[PDB]
Protein backbone atom coordinates (compact mmCIF):
# COMPACT_ATOMS: atom_id res chain seq x y z
CA UNK A 1 0.00 0.00 0.00
CA UNK A 2 0.99 3.65 -0.55
CA UNK A 3 4.78 3.69 -1.16
CA UNK A 4 7.49 4.84 1.31
CA UNK A 5 7.61 7.68 3.78
CA UNK A 6 7.53 5.44 6.85
CA UNK A 7 10.21 6.06 9.53
CA UNK A 8 11.01 2.50 10.76
CA UNK A 9 8.84 2.78 13.88
CA UNK A 10 5.89 3.53 11.54
CA UNK A 11 6.55 0.29 9.62
CA UNK A 12 6.69 -1.95 12.71
CA UNK A 13 3.31 -0.55 13.74
CA UNK A 14 1.86 -1.27 10.32
CA UNK A 15 3.18 -4.83 10.36
CA UNK A 16 1.79 -5.26 13.88
CA UNK A 17 -1.70 -4.33 12.66
CA UNK A 18 -1.76 -6.19 9.31
CA UNK A 19 -0.32 -9.52 10.47
CA UNK A 20 -0.97 -9.87 14.24
CA UNK A 21 -4.02 -7.81 15.29
CA UNK A 22 -5.71 -8.89 12.06
CA UNK A 23 -5.71 -12.61 13.00
CA UNK A 24 -8.95 -14.48 13.61
CA UNK A 25 -9.66 -13.95 17.30
CA UNK A 26 -9.60 -17.69 18.12
CA UNK A 27 -6.08 -17.85 16.57
CA UNK A 28 -4.79 -14.70 18.36
CA UNK A 29 -3.11 -16.75 21.11
CA UNK A 30 -1.87 -19.64 18.92
CA UNK A 31 1.90 -20.09 19.09
CA UNK A 32 2.14 -21.83 15.72
CA UNK A 33 -0.01 -19.16 14.02
CA UNK A 34 1.70 -16.12 15.63
CA UNK A 35 5.06 -17.49 14.39
CA UNK A 36 3.62 -18.02 10.92
CA UNK A 37 2.48 -14.38 11.04
CA UNK A 38 5.86 -13.13 12.39
CA UNK A 39 7.71 -14.90 9.57
CA UNK A 40 5.19 -13.81 6.90
CA UNK A 41 5.66 -10.21 8.19
CA UNK A 42 9.42 -10.62 8.04
CA UNK A 43 9.23 -11.74 4.41
CA UNK A 44 6.79 -8.90 3.61
CA UNK A 45 9.32 -6.49 5.11
CA UNK A 46 12.40 -7.96 3.36
CA UNK A 47 10.86 -8.61 -0.09
CA UNK A 48 8.31 -5.76 -0.44
CA UNK A 49 8.61 -2.90 2.07
CA UNK A 50 12.38 -2.61 1.78
CA UNK A 51 11.88 -2.52 -2.05
CA UNK A 52 9.72 0.64 -1.96
CA UNK A 53 12.39 2.06 0.45
CA UNK A 54 16.08 1.13 0.74
CA UNK A 55 17.41 2.85 3.94
CA UNK A 56 15.49 0.31 6.11
CA UNK A 57 17.82 -2.32 7.57
CA UNK A 58 17.25 -5.87 6.50
CA UNK A 59 17.44 -7.86 9.74
CA UNK A 60 16.65 -11.56 9.47
CA UNK A 61 14.26 -13.21 11.83
CA UNK A 62 16.18 -12.86 15.13
CA UNK A 63 16.29 -9.06 15.37
CA UNK A 64 13.11 -8.24 13.46
CA UNK A 65 11.22 -10.55 15.83
CA UNK A 66 12.49 -8.70 18.94
CA UNK A 67 11.67 -5.30 17.41
CA UNK A 68 8.15 -6.52 16.61
CA UNK A 69 7.54 -7.92 20.13
CA UNK A 70 8.44 -4.44 21.46
CA UNK A 71 5.74 -2.81 19.26
CA UNK A 72 2.97 -5.49 19.57
CA UNK A 73 1.89 -6.27 23.18
CA UNK A 74 -0.22 -9.25 22.02
CA UNK A 75 2.92 -10.86 20.59
CA UNK A 76 4.90 -10.12 23.76
CA UNK A 77 2.82 -12.29 26.16
CA UNK A 78 2.09 -15.27 23.82
CA UNK A 79 5.72 -20.12 26.20
CA UNK A 80 9.31 -18.87 25.56
CA UNK A 81 11.10 -22.16 24.61
CA UNK A 82 9.11 -22.92 21.46
CA UNK A 83 9.59 -19.36 20.32
CA UNK A 84 13.37 -19.87 20.63
CA UNK A 85 13.00 -23.19 18.84
CA UNK A 86 11.33 -21.15 16.07
CA UNK A 87 14.18 -18.62 15.80
CA UNK A 88 17.00 -21.17 16.19
CA UNK A 89 16.02 -23.13 13.14
CA UNK A 90 14.52 -20.36 11.00
CA UNK A 91 17.87 -18.52 11.31
CA UNK A 92 18.68 -17.58 7.68
CA UNK A 93 22.42 -18.46 8.22
CA UNK A 94 25.34 -15.99 7.55
CA UNK A 95 27.32 -16.06 4.24
CA UNK A 96 31.08 -15.26 3.89
CA UNK A 97 33.04 -14.96 0.59
CA UNK A 98 35.21 -12.62 -1.53
CA UNK A 99 35.37 -10.00 -4.26
CA UNK A 100 38.78 -10.60 -5.91
CA UNK A 101 39.96 -7.54 -7.87
CA UNK A 102 42.61 -7.54 -10.61
CA UNK A 103 45.22 -4.93 -9.49
CA UNK A 104 43.92 -1.98 -11.42
CA UNK A 105 40.67 -2.70 -9.51
CA UNK A 106 38.74 -2.57 -12.78
CA UNK A 107 37.87 -6.26 -12.96
CA UNK A 108 36.53 -8.85 -10.45
CA UNK A 109 36.24 -12.63 -10.43
CA UNK A 110 32.66 -13.80 -10.84
CA UNK A 111 31.28 -17.26 -10.72
CA UNK A 112 28.32 -19.16 -12.21
CA UNK A 113 26.84 -22.55 -11.42
CA UNK A 114 25.25 -25.48 -13.25
CA UNK A 115 21.76 -24.60 -11.98
CA UNK A 116 18.95 -23.39 -14.29
CA UNK A 117 18.31 -19.76 -13.16
CA UNK A 118 22.13 -19.48 -13.72
CA UNK A 119 23.35 -15.94 -13.03
CA UNK A 120 26.77 -14.64 -12.00
CA UNK A 121 27.86 -13.96 -8.43
CA UNK A 122 30.90 -13.66 -6.22
CA UNK A 123 32.23 -16.93 -4.80
CA UNK A 124 30.60 -17.32 -1.36
CA UNK A 125 28.31 -19.34 0.87
CA UNK A 126 27.05 -20.47 4.25
CA UNK A 127 29.44 -20.53 7.21
CA UNK A 128 30.20 -23.93 8.85
CA UNK A 129 30.17 -25.28 12.40
CA UNK A 130 33.11 -24.00 14.50
CA UNK A 131 34.47 -22.10 11.47
CA UNK A 132 35.78 -18.49 11.47
CA UNK A 133 34.36 -15.81 9.21
CA UNK A 134 37.78 -15.69 7.48
CA UNK A 135 37.97 -19.49 7.13
CA UNK A 136 34.53 -19.58 5.40
CA UNK A 137 35.65 -16.93 2.86
CA UNK A 138 38.86 -18.81 2.08
CA UNK A 139 37.01 -22.14 1.81
CA UNK A 140 34.18 -20.93 -0.41
CA UNK A 141 36.71 -19.14 -2.68
CA UNK A 142 38.96 -22.21 -3.01
CA UNK A 143 36.11 -24.65 -3.54
CA UNK A 144 34.46 -22.46 -6.23
CA UNK A 145 37.45 -20.88 -8.09
CA UNK A 146 40.36 -23.12 -7.06
CA UNK A 147 42.39 -20.09 -5.86
CA UNK A 148 43.90 -20.13 -2.37
CA UNK A 149 43.51 -16.54 -1.24
CA UNK A 150 44.98 -17.35 2.21
CA UNK A 151 48.04 -15.22 1.86
CA UNK A 152 46.12 -12.05 0.91
CA UNK A 153 42.70 -12.03 2.60
CA UNK A 154 42.36 -9.15 5.10
CA UNK A 155 39.83 -9.40 8.02
CA UNK A 156 39.38 -5.61 8.06
CA UNK A 157 38.62 -5.28 4.30
CA UNK A 158 35.10 -6.39 3.40
CA UNK A 159 31.59 -5.32 2.53
CA UNK A 160 29.25 -6.57 5.25
CA UNK A 161 25.48 -6.32 4.82
CA UNK A 162 22.12 -8.04 5.27
CA UNK A 163 20.16 -9.04 2.16
CA UNK A 164 16.69 -10.60 2.39
CA UNK A 165 17.52 -11.09 6.08
CA UNK A 166 20.79 -13.01 5.51
CA UNK A 167 23.97 -11.42 6.69
CA UNK A 168 26.51 -11.39 3.83
CA UNK A 169 30.14 -10.42 4.26
CA UNK A 170 32.48 -10.53 1.24
CA UNK A 171 36.20 -9.91 1.75
CA UNK A 172 37.61 -7.61 -0.87
CA UNK A 173 41.04 -8.86 -2.02
CA UNK A 174 42.85 -6.78 -4.71
CA UNK A 175 46.00 -7.49 -6.73
CA UNK A 176 45.11 -10.93 -8.07
CA UNK A 177 47.02 -11.51 -11.25
CA UNK A 178 45.04 -11.63 -14.51
CA UNK A 179 46.92 -14.88 -15.32
CA UNK A 180 45.59 -16.69 -12.26
CA UNK A 181 44.45 -20.14 -13.35
CA UNK A 182 40.82 -20.64 -12.27
CA UNK A 183 29.64 -27.10 -8.62
CA UNK A 184 30.97 -24.53 -11.10
CA UNK A 185 30.54 -24.15 -14.88
CA UNK A 186 32.42 -20.90 -15.44
CA UNK A 187 34.96 -18.65 -13.64
CA UNK A 188 35.64 -15.32 -15.32
CA UNK A 189 36.83 -11.78 -14.92
CA UNK A 190 34.18 -9.15 -15.57
CA UNK A 191 34.72 -5.43 -16.01
CA UNK A 192 33.07 -3.54 -13.16
CA UNK A 193 31.91 -0.79 -15.58
CA UNK A 194 30.08 -3.48 -17.59
CA UNK A 195 28.24 -4.67 -14.46
CA UNK A 196 24.65 -3.40 -14.11
CA UNK A 197 24.77 -0.52 -11.64
CA UNK A 198 28.50 0.41 -11.18
CA UNK A 199 28.53 3.65 -13.21
CA UNK A 200 21.33 -8.45 -20.19
CA UNK A 201 21.34 -7.19 -16.61
CA UNK A 202 19.31 -10.06 -15.12
CA UNK A 203 22.45 -12.24 -15.24
CA UNK A 204 23.97 -10.14 -12.42
CA UNK A 205 21.35 -9.78 -9.65
CA UNK A 206 23.45 -11.61 -7.01
CA UNK A 207 26.12 -8.83 -7.50
CA UNK A 208 24.30 -5.46 -7.76
CA UNK A 209 23.78 -4.73 -4.01
CA UNK A 210 27.56 -4.81 -3.48
CA UNK A 211 28.47 -2.51 -6.37
CA UNK A 212 27.78 0.73 -4.50
CA UNK A 213 29.92 -0.03 -1.39
CA UNK A 214 32.55 -1.84 -3.52
CA UNK A 215 32.99 1.20 -5.77
CA UNK A 216 33.27 3.33 -2.59
CA UNK A 217 36.02 1.06 -1.28
CA UNK A 218 37.90 1.33 -4.59
CA UNK A 219 37.60 5.13 -4.62
CA UNK A 220 39.04 5.27 -1.14
CA UNK A 221 41.78 2.80 -2.03
CA UNK A 222 43.03 4.83 -5.00
CA UNK A 223 42.92 8.07 -3.01
CA UNK A 224 44.96 6.49 -0.20
CA UNK A 225 47.50 4.96 -2.62
CA UNK A 226 48.12 8.45 -4.05
CA UNK A 227 48.21 10.77 -1.03
CA UNK A 228 51.01 12.03 1.24
CA UNK A 229 49.36 13.49 4.39
CA UNK A 230 49.78 17.14 5.43
Curated annotation (Swiss-Prot):
Name of the gene this protein is made from: dcp2
Effect upon mutating residue 44 to A: Decreases interaction with dcp1
Subunit record text: Component of the decapping complex composed of dcp1 and dcp2. Interacts with edc3. Interacts with pdc1; via N-terminus. Interacts with pdc2.
Residue numbers binding ATP: 164, 205
Region annotated Interaction with pdc1, chain positions: 1-228
Superkingdom classification of source: Eukaryota
Effect of substituting residue 19 to A: Decreases interaction with dcp1
Protein name from the UniProt record: mRNA decapping complex subunit 2
Protein purpose: Catalytic component of the decapping complex necessary for the degradation of mRNAs, both in normal mRNA turnover and in nonsense-mediated mRNA decay. Removes the 7-methyl guanine cap structure from mRNA molecules, yielding a 5'-phosphorylated mRNA fragment and 7m-GDP. Decapping is the major pathway of mRNA degradation in yeast. It occurs through deadenylation, decapping and subsequent 5' to 3' exonucleolytic decay of the transcript body.
Motif (Nudix box): 125-146
Protein localization: Cytoplasm, P-body
Effect of residue 183 to A: Abolishes the decapping activity in vitro
Stated family: Belongs to the Nudix hydrolase family. DCP2 subfamily.
Span covered, complete protein: 1 to 245 of 741
Residue ranges of every copy of the Nudix hydrolase domain listed in the record: 91-212
Amino acid sequence: MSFTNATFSQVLDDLSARFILNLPAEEQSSVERLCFQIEQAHWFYEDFIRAQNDQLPSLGLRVFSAKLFAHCPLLWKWHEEAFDDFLRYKTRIPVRGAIMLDMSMQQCVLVKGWKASSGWGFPKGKIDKDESDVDCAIREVYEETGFDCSSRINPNEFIDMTIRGQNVRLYIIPGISLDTRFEISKIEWHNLMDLPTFKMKNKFYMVIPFLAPLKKWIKKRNIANNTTKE
